């Protein structure tokens, strides 16, 4: 009922994000030879009393929320495929990549434009005050 103090939970959120980016880096670096391995169950698996177990075990049809949001994202891009020919999309993505290159070199040149005691001896004075010897300098 009481939340932890915010720095620890922020650290947990950051390390979970780093863990998931490690997950997708591992999976995307091993992209192929994972598209090439299809999974099927075995006769040792109970496919009569536990086929409900296996049908939601190999499923690649994701939850409706993520792909309705994905299709919402698709139409908000401002460009689609259903009324444009594919080479127009290819050249639009090419010029968008050129615009990314221009923007990152603008950031690069804007970033590169700028830069990123002792006056005496206490013992000798005390030896004077107790004995009379002058402080030798």
């Amino acid at each position: 009922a009481e939340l932890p103090q915010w720095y620890t939970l922020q650290s947990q959120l950051n390390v979970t994000l780093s863990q998931l980016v490690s997950v997708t880096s591992t999976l995307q670096h091993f992209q192929e030879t994972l598209d090439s391995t299809v999974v099927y169950p075995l006769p040792k698996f109970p496919t009569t009393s536990h086929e409900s177990l296996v049908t939601t075990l190999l499923r690649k049809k994701n939850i409706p929320e993520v792909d309705e949001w994905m299709k919402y994202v698709r139409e908000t891009s401002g460009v689609t495929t259903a009324l444009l020919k594919d080479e127009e999309i290819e050249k639009l993505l090419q010029q968008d990549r050129e615009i990314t290159n221009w923007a990152r070199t603008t950031f690069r040149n804007e970033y590169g434009k700028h830069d990123f005691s002792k006056p005496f001896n206490v013992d000798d004075v005390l030896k004077f005050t107790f004995t009379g010897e002058k402080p030798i300098i």
């Binding site: 090439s36 299809v38 698996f45 190999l58 999309i89």
Partner: protein, 440 residues
């Protein structure tokens, strides 16, 4: 914006349900990949299994085979690229909204903080002292107490928390009720009856609040030291009524020094004067204690009551000595001036009276400025006589509520007396003897 408890618990429950779904999907993904792992390894995948799953299905029950290597087509390439562009655009819009909202919050917070700091500057001078304090948050507390400026009062140190009130546009001090003490002068009619009042003393901003808090703690300290002093004067008609109001009983007047919370009378002026005497005498105690702490290594940590307070003793002794002088003048008149054929009673005040440093000399001259109030009241009353008898009466009060008469008499027709009295009937019959024995 404002957010409520039900909104808070609703947001908590919905993020809890979303993260429940997150861990569910991640756990089924992990449990699937470990199930497929257990077909070929059986060692490491069994660790991350669920006990219920191992109960219901045995491991090594899945298998995979290789479909041939395929080059992905350009149609899904451009599909993924256009979806990437859409996802990037949506993320950029979300980032813009987040940054705008956080800027609005930061701008409001910075406006409040800069108003607070400008109030701090236009409010606090460098003469004042401020230090951090915890509740556990950081608060700036100003020390307005007199304890480091001569006071010895550990019951209530003057510490006030400075709080910012944006609505009031001013800084308010929270002491970490306005009760100023006032005096009442009750005269007595010439019938030995109940006392009627004849006079009484008179009864926002950051600096006004600091001054008011210093005034409040000063009056509380003054009333505390008065109450401590009255126990030594209980024998002289001085009574502590209710630990916040003391009464001074006089044969013709009555002073009521009361500490209370919340038209021109004859004795209002004297009441105001007595109030300023009380405050100045407390200041004199502060100066003497500060001098002792400065000039000595040990200093005065506590105040001795009969030696170091002297608050109501001097001001009571002034009027008490006035009454004693009136009684002595009446007695001298009756027993000499009503008897001899012409003499004048003449009163003259009689007086008797290294560490060179600016601070010590300043403290000494400040204390000696108030010597004429703080000292023992003394007066010598000398009566001339026709010739050659000489007679003098030095009236003094070594205790501020006491009475000592040091009569000195000599005559040429010889005798020479120097005697001390503590009462007035002895003066009466002594003078009655002297006038008939030598003057008559």
């Amino acid at each position: 914006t404002v957010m409520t408890q039900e909104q808070f618990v609703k947001r908590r429950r919905d993020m809890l349900e979303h993260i429940n779904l997150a861990m569910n999907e991640s756990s089924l993904a992990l449990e699937f990949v470990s199930l497929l792992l257990s077909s070929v390894k059986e060692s490491t995948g069994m660790s991350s299994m669920s006990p219920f799953l191992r109960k219901v299905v045995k491991p090594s029950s899945l298998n995979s085979d290789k479909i041939p290597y395929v080059a992905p087509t350009k149609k899904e390439y451009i599909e993924l690229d256009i979806l990437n562009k859409g996802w990037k655009l949506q993320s950029l819009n979300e980032s813009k909204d987040l940054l705008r909202a956080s800027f609005n919050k930061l701008s409001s917070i910075l406006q409040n903080e800069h108003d607070y700091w400008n109030k701090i500057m236009q409010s606090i001078s460098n003469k004042d002292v401020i230090f951090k304090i915890r509740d556990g948050q950081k608060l700036l507390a100003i020390k307005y107490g007199y304890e480091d400026s001569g006071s010895t009062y550990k019951h209530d140190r003057g510490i006030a928390n400075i709080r910012n009130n944006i609505e009031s546009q001013n800084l308010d001090l929270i002491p970490h009720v306005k009760k100023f003490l006032r005096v009442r002068i009750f005269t007595k009619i010439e019938s030995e009856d109940d006392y009627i009042l004849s006079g009484e003393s008179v009864m926002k901003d950051i600096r006004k609040q600091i001054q008011l808090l210093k005034k409040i703690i000063f009056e509380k300290e003054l009333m505390y030291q008065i109450k401590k002093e009255c126990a030594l004067l209980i024998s002289y008609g001085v009574s502590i009524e209710n630990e916040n109001k003391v009464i001074i009983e006089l044969p013709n007047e009555k002073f009521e020094i009361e500490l209370l919370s919340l038209l021109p009378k004859i004795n209002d002026k004297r009441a105001n004067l007595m109030l300023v005497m009380l405050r100045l005498l407390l200041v004199v105690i502060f100066k003497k204690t500060l001098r002792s702490r400065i000039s000595s290594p040990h200093g005065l940590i506590n105040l001795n009551v009969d030696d170091d307070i002297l608050i109501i003793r001097p001001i009571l002794g002034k009027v008490r000595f006035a009454n004693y002088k009136l009684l002595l003048k009446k007695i001298i008149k009756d027993y000499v001036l009503d008897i001899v054929p012409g003499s004048s009673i003449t009163e003259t005040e009689v007086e008797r009276e290294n560490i060179d440093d600016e601070n010590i000399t300043k403290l000494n001259k400040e204390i000696r400025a108030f010597d004429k109030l703080l000292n023992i009241p003394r007066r010598e009353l000398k009566i001339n006589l026709p010739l050659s008898p000489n007679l003098s009466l030095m009236l003094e009060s070594p205790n501020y509520c006491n009475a000592l008469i040091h009569i000195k008499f000599s005559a040429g027709t010889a005798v020479s007396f120097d005697t001390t009295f503590s009462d007035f009937k002895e003066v009466e019959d002594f003078l009655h003897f002297i006038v008939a024995e030598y003057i008559q």
